[PDB]
Amino acid sequence: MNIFEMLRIDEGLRLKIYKDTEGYYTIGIGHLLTKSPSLNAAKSELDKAIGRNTNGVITKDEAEKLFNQDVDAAVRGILRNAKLKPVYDSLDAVRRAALINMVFQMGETGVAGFTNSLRMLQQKRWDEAAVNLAKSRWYNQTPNRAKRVITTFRTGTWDAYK
Ligand SMILES: [Cl-]
Ligand SMILES: [Cl-]
């Protein structure tokens, strides 16, 4: 297991524009297009993202290309961020994947808001971080995903994904 396989499980793959859990236009492997209510705004972000006239449908190669870029962007946002970077550097390889997963889902600003959890993660107080991570809108809106990510921080193993 790795970050790519983890996120492919959490996000799924859809080749036509769909609404994510929050109701936003999305495509591929959780690639958010736009928060705007307009499917036309989505299709136009999609064409721009892919560089051709898609009519709301992309191929598997194209979905995987966006995914690679989004994982790369998630990692680069962690390393550019003064709150996230020291936490990431302190973690082992499996728990690093859990942090990336969270940033992918909710963005660098959102995760940087988990001030208390991040401090517990840095201190390696795994059971306490897991409890605090769960007291969140994130956990209450997407409990199955959040549980798998929290388990990963708690144990440092891929057990929630096998
Ligand atoms: Cl893009
Ligand atoms: Cl979920």
**Nearest one of 137, 141, 117, 136 to 128, comparing CA atoms:** 117
Q: Which two tokens stand for residue 82?
A: 């003064």
CA–CA separation, 98 and 115 (whole Å):
16
Taking CA atoms, 77 is separated from 72, 100, 108, 129, in Å, by 9, 9, 6, 22
Which one-letter DSSP state was computed for residue 23? S
CA–CA separation, 139 and 142 (whole Å):
5
Ligand number nearest CA of 21 is 2
> Do the annotations mark residue 117 as ligand-binding?
yes
CA–CA separation, 133 and 152 (whole Å):
12
Backbone angles phi, psi at 145, to 5 degrees: -65, -50
Q: Which two tokens stand for residue 91?
A: 């973690």
Q: Which two tokens stand for residue 71?
A: 């994982």
Domains of the chain: 1-162 (1.10.530.40)
Q: Catalytic: 20?
A: yes
> Do the annotations mark residue 132 as ligand-binding?
yes
